[PDB]
Structure formats: structure tokens, C-alpha cells
From Swiss-Prot:
Tissue specificity: Expressed in heart, brain, placenta, lung, muscle and kidney.
Subunit text: PP2A consists of a common heterodimeric core enzyme, composed of a 36 kDa catalytic subunit (subunit C) and a 65 kDa constant regulatory subunit (PR65 or subunit A), that associates with a variety of regulatory subunits. Proteins that associate with the core dimer include three families of regulatory subunits B (the R2/B/PR55/B55, R3/B''/PR72/PR130/PR59 and R5/B'/B56 families), the 48 kDa variable regulatory subunit, viral proteins, and cell signaling molecules.
Domain of life from the UniProt record: Eukaryota
Task performed by this protein: The B regulatory subunit might modulate substrate selectivity and catalytic activity, and might also direct the localization of the catalytic enzyme to a particular subcellular compartment.
Name used for this protein in its record: Serine/threonine-protein phosphatase 2A regulatory subunit B'' subunit alpha
Binding site for Ca(2+): 187, 189, 191, 198
Ranges of residues in domain EF-hand: 174-209
Amino acid sequence: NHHDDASKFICLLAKPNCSSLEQEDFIPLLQDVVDTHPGLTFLKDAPEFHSRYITTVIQRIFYTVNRSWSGKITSTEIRKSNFLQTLALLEEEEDINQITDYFSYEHFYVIYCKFWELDTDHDLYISQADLSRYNDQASSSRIIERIFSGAVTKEGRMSYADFVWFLISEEDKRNPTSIEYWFRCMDVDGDGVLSMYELEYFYEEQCERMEAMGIEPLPFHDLLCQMLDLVKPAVDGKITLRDLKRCRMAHIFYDTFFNLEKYLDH
Ligand SMILES: [Ca+2]
Ligand SMILES: [Ca+2]
């Protein structure tokens, strides 16, 4: 278990005397894919879409593989992922879009388009203001502030790469990585549990925003009863990440506390 494929792969791409991979270590590999793969060959003629594609794929790799959030990928993380399997499928499939995991170009396209849509001041960075000027209703400024606070890694600017993590997580709150993206945001004190105060702090803005729409919001007491019954935690007042992954309903939970649109759509 020290000389298997995952181990070799780390040795292959790591800097000398290193047993882990950073995002930068995946660049030569991804460049070699854009050059040689028939479904990405058209990117040779736009060597300026290279990075956005390469950066996007690398985000996706770390998003599902780097499960410790360390930023350094180990052979254990590789082993418990289907990444090498995907590389195998990558060599037999001429249509890159049929590779829905990591490499799909249409997947990258959608992400790049949404980044473009949001960058309202056109500076190629996503600010807190950019999100407010696109969609007043979707995400709460309190949850936005958490992201821009460094809860999921102040300059006040979100790069394109960090936006990838945001977009994937906002769209799909079912996969485990997304669940802890939002957990890190809601868990302000970092205690590993979502306290009543924390829950109250986020729900407070949801009430201000509903009342601004002429909608009478549900009182917190009744909300917490619906939510606690949905999660099925261990300890009554102590809601954990493990409880959220288990209940398979974390997306409804999360939207209730910081996404006004997706909440009203329920
Ligand atoms: Ca901007
Ligand atoms: Ca907490």
C-alpha cells in the first residue's frame, strides 16, 4: 500500500522530497491533456482559455479529492477518489463532454459564463457588491460575508478559482464537499456545531428580507422545530456536520437559513 497507483501518482507529480500535491503540481498534467486530447484540441487556438479550463478542472479535482481541505492532496485522498479511473476513461473517450467528472468542457463553459455574468464591474474579480447587483434575493449578505471572511479557504475580492467552489456548492448542496463549504460558513465560532445563536443570526436576515417583500416570516421557534426534526441530530441543541451529511436533507436546511429564493420555492 506504499507502491500502488496512488502512491506512484504522487511521486510522479510532486516536488522533490514531497509526498503531497498542490494545485500547481497538476498544471503540467492538465496542459498535456489539452494538447493531446481530440475533444480539447480546439483550445490550442485559444491558449488564453487554457488557464480558465485548466484552473476549473483543478478546482473540481481538489473539490472532490482533497477531502481534508488541506490544499495538499495525498495518496490516501487519491485512493478513495475515482480520479485515476477517470484518467483511464479519458484516454478512450474522444468526446470530452462525456467525461462528466472533472474534465467536461461544457461543465467548465457554464461556470465561466456565470462568472462572466456576475462580474458586473468587469474587473475580473467577484466582489461582495457584484453578488448584490446580480441577484438581490438569492444569497444573504450574512452568508456572503462569511465566504469573504475566509471561512472557506481581508482583500474583499473573490478570484475566479474561489468562485468555482462557490458556484458548484450553491448549485448542488447535496455532495459532501458542498455540505461542509456551507457548514464552515454557518459555524462562526468554529466549534464544529451549529448553535442556536448562529442559526438565529442567519435567520434574522431572512426575516428582514421577507418583511421587505410584504411576506410574514415564520417565528424562529417554529422554524427550529421544523429544522431539528429534519436533521435528526444526536444532541438536541448540537447540530453537527456529520448530522447534516447523514440526514440527506442539508440542501433544504441550508436554503432555509441563507437562500431566500430557494426557500420561498418550498
Ligand atoms: Ca467585479
Ligand atoms: Ca458553532
